[PDB]
């Protein structure tokens, strides 16, 4: 059920309004590679999102 972790985390990345396509691709690919890093990657995405608000 590693893909359920991917799916949940990926939708949370999709929810972020301020990432460009390059950045979305970066985080999604990292999630795709290793779902156990989701909590960390989301934190990183949210921080980057907010800095680009």
């Amino acid at each position, epitope marked *: *059920s*590693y*893909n*359920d972790e*991917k*799916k949940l985390a*990926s*939708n949370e990345i*999709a929810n972020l309004p301020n990432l460009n*396509e390059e950045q*979305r*691709s970066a985080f*999604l*690919s990292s*999630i*795709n*590679d290793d779902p156990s890093q989701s909590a960390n990657l989301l934190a990183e995405a949210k921080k980057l999102n907010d800095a680009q608000a």
Partner: antibody
Amino acid sequence: QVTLRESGPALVKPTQTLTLTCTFSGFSLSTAGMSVGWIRQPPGKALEWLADIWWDDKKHYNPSLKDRLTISKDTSKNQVVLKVTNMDPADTATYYCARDMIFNFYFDVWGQGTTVTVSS
Amino acid sequence: DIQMTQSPSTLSASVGDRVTITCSASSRVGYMHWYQQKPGKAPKLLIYDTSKLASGVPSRFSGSGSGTEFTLTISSLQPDDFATYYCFQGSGYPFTFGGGTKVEIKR
């Protein structure tokens, strides 16, 4: 809207390698989170997932295919190619390609399928 | 890997009947999806994320479940519901399908 179309030989000999091509429209495989997968269905049997490829070039293969599979993409041309080595009459089937997304993990649009027969 | 058994494998019901197909998985998945396949056609997404209706799918269709036990329901069987239905899990690789349930119409 999204459409996919499989193409390849209708007939291949035992031991030969099969090359199938999926050509699609309505979406791009360079889009973040996008994927194409391949599924087959022997006459009168259930569907069996074979492989998938992701926009980031990540690939997965079904162990049931015993390392016989190679998948690749040409994002430029909206094509995904699947190769299957050492074909056997047990591989006679209709072969489908279909779109997946990392937000979904389900195939939401499929091609019409292309029928392959393995015979001398 | 994760495998699924559907029951029944063959089903015969009259028009207007309510029909239920079950899918039991060998281990817990977060979602079950369902495909409908008509004779000579590719599978078509029917239910996704366990209970969500795919586009162009009548309210007649519904899905339920959680853990290892999922069901697809058709609330008023119509002639055009003649098909084989497959459950599908994308929660773990390899992706897998149930063995299918052929739905026949009594008349």
